Structure formats: C-alpha cells, structure tokens
Amino acid sequence: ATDPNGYIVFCPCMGRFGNQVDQFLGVLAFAKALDRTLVLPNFIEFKHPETKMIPFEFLFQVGTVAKYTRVVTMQEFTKKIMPTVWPPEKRKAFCWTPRQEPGCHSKEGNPFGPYWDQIDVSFVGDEYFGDIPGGFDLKWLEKFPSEEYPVLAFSSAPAPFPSKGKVWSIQKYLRWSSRITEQAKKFISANLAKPFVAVHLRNDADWVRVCEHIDTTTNRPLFASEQCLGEGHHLGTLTKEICSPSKQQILEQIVEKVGSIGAKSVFVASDKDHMIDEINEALKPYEIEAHRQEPDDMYTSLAIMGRADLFVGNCVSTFSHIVKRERDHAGQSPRPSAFFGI
Amino acid sequence: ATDPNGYIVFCPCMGRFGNQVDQFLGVLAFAKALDRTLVLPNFIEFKHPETKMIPFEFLFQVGTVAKYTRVVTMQEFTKKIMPTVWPPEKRKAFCWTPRQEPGCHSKEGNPFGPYWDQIDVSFVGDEYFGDIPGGFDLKWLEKFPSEEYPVLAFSSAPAPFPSKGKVWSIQKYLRWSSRITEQAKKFISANLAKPFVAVHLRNDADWVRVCEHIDTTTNRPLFASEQCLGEGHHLGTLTKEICSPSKQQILEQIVEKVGSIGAKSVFVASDKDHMIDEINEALKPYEIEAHRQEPDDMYTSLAIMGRADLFVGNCVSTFSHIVKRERDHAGQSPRPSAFFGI
Numbered sequence: 079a080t081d082p083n084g085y086i087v088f089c090p091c092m093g094r095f096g097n098q099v100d101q102f103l104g105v106l107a108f109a110k111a112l113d114r115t116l117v118l119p120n121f122i123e124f125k126h127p128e129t130k131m132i133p134f135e136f137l138f139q140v141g142t143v144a145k146y147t148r149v150v151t152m153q154e155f156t157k158k159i160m161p162t163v164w165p166p167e168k169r170k171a172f173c174w175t176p177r178q179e180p181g182c183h184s185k186e187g188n189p190f191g192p193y194w195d196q197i198d199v200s201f202v203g204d205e206y207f208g209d210i211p212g213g214f215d216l217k218w219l220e221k222f223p224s225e226e227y228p229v230l231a232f233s234s235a236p237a238p239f240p241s242k243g244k245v246w247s248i249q250k251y252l253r254w255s256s257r258i259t260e261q262a263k264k265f266i267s268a269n270l271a272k273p274f275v276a277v278h279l280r281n282d283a284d285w286v287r288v289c290e291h292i293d294t295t296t297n298r299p300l301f302a303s304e305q306c307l308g309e310g311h312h313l314g315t316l317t318k319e320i321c322s323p324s325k326q327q328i329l330e331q332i333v334e335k336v337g338s339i340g341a342k343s344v345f346v347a348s349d350k351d352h353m354i355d356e357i358n359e360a361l362k363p364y365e366i367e368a369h370r371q372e373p374d375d376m377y378t379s380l381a382i383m384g385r386a387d388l389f390v391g392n393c394v395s396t397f398s399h400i401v402k403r404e405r406d407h408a409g410q411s412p413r414p415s416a417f418f419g420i
Numbered sequence: 421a422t423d424p425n426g427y428i429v430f431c432p433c434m435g436r437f438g439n440q441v442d443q444f445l446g447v448l449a450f451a452k453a454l455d456r457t458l459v460l461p462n463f464i465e466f467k468h469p470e471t472k473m474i475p476f477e478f479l480f481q482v483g484t485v486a487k488y489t490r491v492v493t494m495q496e497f498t499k500k501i502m503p504t505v506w507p508p509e510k511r512k513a514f515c516w517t518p519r520q521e522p523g524c525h526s527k528e529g530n531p532f533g534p535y536w537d538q539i540d541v542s543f544v545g546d547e548y549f550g551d552i553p554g555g556f557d558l559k560w561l562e563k564f565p566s567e568e569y570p571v572l573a574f575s576s577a578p579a580p581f582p583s584k585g586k587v588w589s590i591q592k593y594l595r596w597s598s599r600i601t602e603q604a605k606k607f608i609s610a611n612l613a614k615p616f617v618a619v620h621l622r623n624d625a626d627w628v629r630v631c632e633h634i635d636t637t638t639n640r641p642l643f644a645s646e647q648c649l650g651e652g653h654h655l656g657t658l659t660k661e662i663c664s665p666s667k668q669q670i671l672e673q674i675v676e677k678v679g680s681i682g683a684k685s686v687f688v689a690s691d692k693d694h695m696i697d698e699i700n701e702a703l704k705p706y707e708i709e710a711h712r713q714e715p716d717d718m719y720t721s722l723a724i725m726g727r728a729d730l731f732v733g734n735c736v737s738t739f740s741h742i743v744k745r746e747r748d749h750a751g752q753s754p755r756p757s758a759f760f761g762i
C-alpha cells in the first residue's frame with residue numbers, strides 16, 4: 079500500500095553537493111513534521127558537459143535514513159507510486175508565492191529543467207504556501223489534504239539555507255553507501271598510516287573571490303561559517319584568513335596538527351590545489367607524507383575525512399560542514415575536528 | 421534633514437500595473453510598520469519596444485499618499501538623499517534567502533535590470549530576512565539598524581501577492597494626479613451623460629488562456645478573485661464565466677445594469693476588444709451609446725471608472741481591483757460596483 083498521508087518530492091536545485099545536503103537535512107525535518115513520506119532526491123553534479131543526476135542510494139544508505147523518517151527511493155516513487163497516485167493532470171508545483179504570468183515557474187533554468195525532465199515530470203498548475211503562518215519552520219494539513227494533494231512537489235527545497243543548528247544532528251542518518259565506505263576503507267588501509275590528519279583545501283579561483291568579498295563590519299553568516307563561529311557569529315568575526323588561508327598558514331597549521339596528535343600520515347581533499355609537494359616538504363621533519371586520491375572523488379573524499387583521526391576543515395565551506403556534522407553525530411560520541419584560522 | 425530611521429526602496433518588479441499597485445499597498449503598510457520612509461517606486465510599462473519607468477507622481481499625488489506614511493519621491497531620493505546616505509559601497513540587496521553562487525541576484529532579468537539601471541544602482545552584497553520570525557507580515561530593527569543599514573533595498577516588493585484584505589483600504593491614499601483627474605473629468609463631461617455605467621472588458625488572448633486553466637475543484641484564489649468571492653473563496657467558486665464572460669453574457673449584463681440605474685451612457689475600458697458596435701446595437705432600445713477613449717489610456721480609464729455612477733468589473737483582474745478599492749475607499753462612503761458573472 080502507499081502512504082495515505084501522501085508524499086513530498088523536491089529538487090535540491092541550489093548549489094553544489096554541500097549546499098544540496100545542507101538543504102536536504104532541513105527537508106528531512108520538514109517531511110517528518112508534515113507526516114508525509116519523502117521521495118529521496120537525486121543529487122546534482124555540474125562538472126560534466128551536462129548536468130547529471132545521481133540517485134540518493136548511490137551515495138547514502140536508504141536503511142539508515144529511514145530510521146529518521148519515512149522515505150522512498152526516486153525509482154520506487156517514479157515506477158511504482160507516481161503513475162496511479164500522481165498522474166500528469168494533478169502535478170502541481172509548490173512555491174512560496176507568485177514570482178516574475180506570475181507563478182512558480184518551476185522548470186525554467188538549470189538545474190530546474192533537467193531535474194524534472196529526468197523523471198519525465200511537467201507541471202500543470204501552481205499551489206502557494208507563503209500565506210501559511212510560520213512557513214516551513216514547523217495548517218499545512220488544513221490547506222493541503224492528502225486526497226486532493228497526494229504529492230507536494232517543490233522545485234526549491236522547502237528548507238533554510240544555510241541550515242539551522244537544529245537540523246545538523248540529522249547528518250547521523252546519512253551513512254555512505256557500502257560502495258563508498260569500502261573505497262574509503264581501502265584507501266586508508268593502503269595509503270594512510272594511523273593516526274592520520276585529513277584536511278579540506280577549498281581553493282579554486284571562484285572561492286578566493288567569495289572570501290575577498292567578506293564584509294567584516296556586518297559580519298553576517300556566509301555559507302557554513304556558523305559551524306565554527308556559532309549562530310549569527312556570536313563567537314567571533316569571519317575573516318579572509320579563515321575563509322581562504324594563505325599557503326603559509328595552511329602549511330604551518332598542518333604541521334602543528336601533525337605534531338599535536340603524532341600523525342603518521344596526512345590526507346588531502348581539494349577542489350583544485352592539493353599542495354602535495356608543498357605539504358610533503360613541510361612534513362619532512364616528521365618523515366611522513368600527504369596523500370590524495372587521483373582523481374579526487376568528492377564522495378569518497380568526504381567519507382575518508384569522516385574516518386580521520388583528526389579533521390581540519392574550511393569553516394565557510396558547506397562541503398567541510400558535511401564532514402563536521404558526520405564527525406559530530408554519526409557515532410555516539412563526536413570525533414575531533416578543527417578549522418583553518420580558528 | 422534626512423530620516424534617522426532610514427529608507428526603504430523597491431522594484432514593483434512583478435507583473436503589469438494592477439499587480440504593481442496590488443503589491444505597493446502591502447509595501448506602504450510594511451514601511452509604516454518599520455517606521456522607515458518609503459521611496460515611492462517608479463511604475464513599469466511593458467507595451468513599448470523597451471521597458472519604461474513611470475514616476476509615481478506622474479500617476480498619483482504625493483501629498484495624499486503622505487497622509488498614510490512618510491514618503492519621498494524617487495527624484496528626491498536619487499538626487500538629494502542617496503549620494504551621502506547610501507553611496508555605492510553600502511548598496512546591499514535584500515531578499516528572503518539565497519537563491520540559485522547563491523544570493524539575491526537582484527538585477528538579473530527584466531524588469532529587474534532596467535529598473536535599477538534607470539536610477540544608476542548596482543548592488544555590492546546581500547542581506548537576508550527570511551530568518552526573521554513572521555517575515556514581512558508585521559526584530560527587523562534588531563537585525564537592520566539605521567546606522568549600518570540606512571536603506572533597505574528590495575528587488576522584489578516586500579508584500580504579499582495577491583494583496584490581503586487588510587491593506588485594501590490603503591487605496592484611499594492613492595489619488596490620481598491632477599493631470600489624470602482633469603483628463604477623466606473632461607472625457608466624462610464631453611462624452612458620458614449621467615448616470616453612466618463603466619465596464620472593464622479584460623479580453624486579450626493571454627487572458628482567455630489564464631481563465632481556461634481554472635481548476636474549479638481546488639478553487640484557489642486567482643489574482644484579484646477574492647475581491648468578489650471573499651478570502652479563500654468563502655463565498656463561492658471561481659468559474660470561467662466569471663473570469664472570461666462570453667460576448668453574449670457581457671451584452672446581457674450591460675443592458676441589465678443600464679436598465680437598473682436608468683443609465684444615459686456607457687463607458688468601456690478594454691485591453692483589446694471594446695465591443696463598441698456590439699454594445700451600441702444592444703443599447704438601441706435605450707437610445708444611449710457606449711464610448712471609449714482613443715487610444716485607451718490605462719490610467720485615465722481607471723480614473724473614469726472610479727468616477728462612474730456604477731462600475732462593472734472583472735473579478736479576476738487586478739486592474740479591475742484598483743477600481744473596486746478606489747470606489748470602496750476613496751470617499752467616506754463606498755460607490756457601487758458589480759462584477760460580470762456575480
């Protein structure tokens with residue numbers, strides 16, 4: 079049987095993987111609060127000639143996320159549930175309010191178009207929820223009953239971004255697929271003498287520009303920055319030094335952390351410059367080396383960093399934030415983490 | 421001296437004139453609640469080779485709107501206030517939350533680009549307000565103090581659409597410019613024997629398509645439809661017959677209303693087909709005629725309809741809704757109105 083309360087389906091249609099996971103935690107909480115089954119999203123990759131959709135279960139374990147709230151895979155929804163529960167005629171798009179005729183416009187642009195195209199979904203009308211007192215920070219049952227609205231479909235994730243502290247613990251329920259876990263275990267065993275320090279070096283050209291725009295006087299959250307500076311930055315000011323450490327600062331801090339734990343190796347995950355030769359020179363006095371995956375597979379890198387004896391991340395990066403939350407919440411006790419410039 | 425509490429400036433960047441006015445009422449209420457001076461928006465026309473900005477005071481009287489809340493013209497803001505109060509470096513865009521790197525993207529598309537271009541404004545950073553409990557349905561003072569944030573700038577009007585019943589009475593404070601008022605008075609005196617019925621015929625091709633999409637089972641508000649069917653349509657179901665009356669239905673109802681008030685003329689405002697010859701044939705038994713402006717000037721048409729002995733509008737149209745609110749609220753007592761199919 080299908081869920082009498084109905085379903086929620088959405089596109090994680092903002093940003094790259096760290097942003098998608100950040101909003102997905104909020105959506106999980108939203109679905110549980112509404113008591114509707116969540117269709118697990120396809121994640122989205124952009125580093126290809128075309129946008130590419132990745133099934134949830136390629137990356138994470140369905141069994142584990144189900145321990146938080148009721149879920150179904152996109153494949154089950156698409157093949158088994160949709161045809162009778164949600165036929166083309168009742169496929170309505172849900173959004174906050176009409177936007178610039180005025181409506182949700184759920185399939186314009188990228189990845190909005192390709193995401194819904196992938197599952198052969200087009201929308202035939204709009205439903206608005208901006209007038210519901212409190213929005214999605216959980217009337218919804220009053221406004222959208224299951225019989226007429228079996229599926230709530232959102233082209234934008236119905237979740238805050240950046241994520242609120244309240245949902246960070248939901249990362250406990252995102253467990254890497256067995257394939258990724260095994261790839262991580264194998265790389266560690268073959269390459270990384272323990273204890274090892276794992277570091278995230280976020281350093282592509284677009285990033286340095288993001289950091290150089292930091293306005294220290296207004297000191298607002300930027301992406302994941304509350305993971306080290308607290309809600310609304312109550313613990314301090316976000317600086318360029320934290321957002322984009324100098325090569326010198328990276329080396330000094332890696333060497334310090336190697337010393338602090340008696341590390342026997344270093345793992346580096348990077349979007350661009352892994353600094354392997356530079357780190358290796360700096361580590362010569364300790365007779366250990368830094369190691370990277372070739373090529374650098376983002377998911378296996380996240381998994382390796384979650385398994386590290388010590389993780390040093392980038393406080394602003396939502397990609398680092400995945401690792402921080404996993405280390406904080408996957409187990410019964412947190413595994414230690416630090417951040418550059420903190 | 422300038423307002424120590426600061427300013428609000430915004431683009432009425434959604435839809436045509438009826439939509440812009442509908443959101444402007446909500447923005448007026450918002451500015452009064454925040455106790456900031458409102459920069460009066462340029463309105464936007466699209467029926468030209470390029471988007472065209474119209475100063476507020478070309479259409480409405482500054483003196484009258486000021487009786488509701490503190491306001492300044494765009495010209496005063498732009499020439500006298502902006503240069504010292506809000507220089508390029510502190511021009512931040514305000515939006516609900518980051519949108520697809522993630523941010524407000526306040527100048528992408530049309531009329532967003534041309535609107536801010538017109539006043540030589542570019543933005544250098546973003547501020548978000550989605551995390552403020554209750555949104556803009558008036559913490560704002562706590563989050564955005566006047567000293568650092570002298571000007572809150574919104575690329576989307578910080579107001580509901582369609583407008584809520586609570587702000588409809590603000591139309592009392594939108595009084596046509598003396599130029600428009602005089603044009604209306606002259607047309608009435610020269611052409612329209614009293615008492616006269618004024619009708620709004622919304623009938624361009626795009627409109628009939630809007631109406632044909634009506635889902636009577638879900639019966640949600642569509643544009644201005646709550647002006648005749650009440651909040652959330654508590655009074656009835658929106659039909660195609662109400663949204664887009666047949667020519668036959670238009671004629672029958674005009675003749676009925678002419679009879680009801682002993683009308684000595686009819687005025688027709690239309691976006692497309694004024695039906696003058698057809699209405700004239702139908703009015704032959706009464707020996708009166710229907711009259712239109714050539715060309716049909718939308719603002720003078722609104723003003724004429726506000727002055728009519730009886731107005732028959734289109735319940736779905738936000739353009740008709742301007743007339744309904746003016747007739748309800750400009751004076752001490754409402755002037756009578758009706759709608760096709762109601």
Ligand SMILES: Nc1nc2c(ncn2[C@@H]2O[C@H](COP(=O)(O)OP(=O)(O)O)[C@@H](O)[C@H]2O)c(=O)[nH]1
Nearest residue numbers: 093094095096097347348349374376395396397
């Ligand atoms: N491979 C690999 N790609 C990365 C790394 N770091 C950042 N990227 C890439 O750039 C992206 C990040 O944008 P998002 O994860 O949203 O993280 P933020 O942009 O860091 O908040 C990440 O999905 C990968 O695609 C890494 O360590 N490895």
Ligand SMILES: Nc1nc2c(ncn2[C@@H]2O[C@H](COP(=O)(O)OP(=O)(O)O)[C@@H](O)[C@H]2O)c(=O)[nH]1
Nearest residue numbers: 435436437438439689690691716718737738739
């Ligand atoms: N001139 C003239 N233009 C009209 C009339 N009615 C609708 N239009 C045009 O089509 C537009 C309406 O879209 P908007 O006013 O937002 O009204 P809705 O689209 O009717 O909610 C209106 O601004 C004019 O530009 C009319 O009676 N006269």
Ligand SMILES: [Mn+2]
Nearest residue numbers: 093094097521
């Ligand atoms: Mn990013």
Ligand SMILES: [Mn+2]
Nearest residue numbers: 179435436439
């Ligand atoms: Mn319209």
